[PDB]
Design a protein around this ligand. Structure first.
Ligand SMILES: COc1ccc(CNC(=O)c2ccc3nccnc3c2)cc1
Ligand SMILES: COc1ccc(CNC(=O)c2ccc3nccnc3c2)cc1
Lengths: 286, 286
């Protein structure tokens, strides 16, 4: 059963999906999601990174339980996963893509600004605020996240490479572009939402999946993409770049013409206030 | 001053060189070396890896103190560093090279067998048993050592790389050859001992050091190397290989003709017994 400590604070209820169950906080009679990561190392880090992070498009941890299985109290996303909105070739409206992707770009930028590589961005980790088409999106599943700190390469470089291996000196070139893996993931999420299908698939194709990804030669159905804008596909193209040093950054994509949309940005700020206003404390007037 | 706890067990004396001082264990009136790593993370790992390791060519930790500065009680190597035997173009006899290198190859093999990449092998980390030419050698300075475990790449590979970045799939090729950095270091140690000079130096040369190492084009003075054997240089050549996948392994070098020397191997076993016999307990006879 559920630990005594979890039970004192919350009323565990129906499963929402490492399993996720809906629960109610006793103090507040408020709906919460409780993630069960069964028993282990990355859960300690996950909690640690989450406690530190603070952005509207990144999920917030409310409480945490160490027991036979780990329990993570998270704010409830009533729109569910982004995946449920893209399955079976379900294509989102272009503005609905713009609004979500923008938020993803902001979230990921913050992560990168704060030296955090998510490493596992997928529609199955993007959560929607409401059951509304226009809503706030939150990045979840920080299990695979990496922290940046002082590299063992940086420390090595301070010395004279008399005995140093060549491959290490070689590594110095490509070094410090790990984060660009999130930009590719973003590129794959954005390709999916627009088209309805994945860029690199094993469906009706003779070429290997590894080959597709390494070649950067995505499956392009123009009949499907005729529906999508010129600006939207140019961004996908700019992100789905093989050379990580040449790929777009979160900043570069944010700058891109596709995202320079005032009606979209307005909708987002208007969504932010709507959430924020409830928790708002009176401010000191001039 | 020295902590109260260190003082209770040992009598701290004269400096031997992160500083190293000679000390005397009170219980035993025995000479010991006490390494002072001033205050920090890698010291915890260093101790941890050392406690676990157990080989005649790897240094043994005797005790350890957590204070304002870290204190590591190590077995005293009365011949000092290997560096003191190679400075100012001091060249060791070929058999003296064979005997030491063999021991280095064994030590490093054990490290690799046990999933430990030393990462910082240099003459300044190779310690000699006695002030004798023929003696036992011990690998020290485990500060930069890496542990092998389950890679985050191995875990990634279990899934479908739908959203996975190309550079990661690319990395799978070169993956799991980090240890070959120790074989290069070994190659550079062996080149030094034989010749008296370093293979990749900035002395009287127009080419960059990084370039020398990346090109794998070592400084070759035949007048100096005429003195050395054909078998000895072939091993250096086999180790100083640019492609880490093509480089010699500790096993491969151990197999090499240069090391297939019975008089050398005999001398080593004879040195082992000499050390071991003092600590020897009577064995149960057949
Ligand atoms: C009224 O109760 C509900 C209404 C809508 C939903 C849809 N949401 C979900 O399915 C869901 C699943 C996992 C989650 N993990 C973390 C945060 N929020 C989550 C939300 C779930 C319950
Ligand atoms: C009688 O007293 C001595 C005789 C010879 C020496 C030469 N040895 C050393 O110089 C020395 C230095 C650092 C070390 N670090 C770890 C283990 N052993 C070490 C030995 C040092 C003292």
């Amino acid at each position: 059963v559920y630990p005594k400590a979890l039970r004192d604070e919350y009323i565990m209820s129906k499963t929402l999906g490492g399993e996720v169950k809906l629960a109610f906080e006793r103090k507040t009679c408020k709906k919460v999601a409780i993630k069960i990561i069964s028993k282990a190392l990355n859960v300690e880090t996950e909690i640690e990174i989450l406690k530190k992070l603070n952005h509207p498009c990144i999920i917030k941890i409310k409480n945490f339980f160490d027991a036979e299985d780990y329990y993570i109290v998270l704010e409830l996303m009533e729109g569910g996963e982004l995946f449920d909105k893209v399955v079976g070739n379900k294509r989102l409206k272009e503005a609905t893509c713009k609004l979500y992707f923008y938020q993803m770009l902001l979230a990921v930028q913050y992560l990168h600004e704060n030296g955090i590589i998510h490493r596992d961005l997928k529609p199955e980790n993007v959560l929607l605020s409401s059951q509304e088409e226009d809503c706030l999106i939150k990045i979840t599943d920080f299990g695979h996240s990496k922290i940046l700190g002082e590299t063992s390469l940086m420390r090595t470089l301070c010395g004279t490479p008399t005995y140093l291996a060549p491959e290490v000196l070689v590594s110095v070139g490509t070094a410090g572009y790990n984060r660009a893996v999130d930009c590719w993931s973003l590129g794959v999420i954005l390709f999916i939402c627009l088209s309805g299908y994945p860029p690199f698939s094993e469906h009706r194709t003779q070429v290997s999946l590894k080959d597709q990804i390494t070649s950067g030669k995505y499956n392009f159905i123009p009949e499907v993409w005729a529906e999508v804008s010129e600006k939207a596909l140019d961004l996908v193209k700019k992100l789905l770049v093989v050379d990580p040093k040449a790929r777009f950054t979160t900043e570069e994509a944010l700058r891109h013409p596709w995202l320079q949309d005032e009606d979209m940005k307005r909708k987002f700020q208007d969504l932010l206030s709507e959430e924020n206003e409830s928790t708002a404390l009176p401010q000191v007037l001039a």
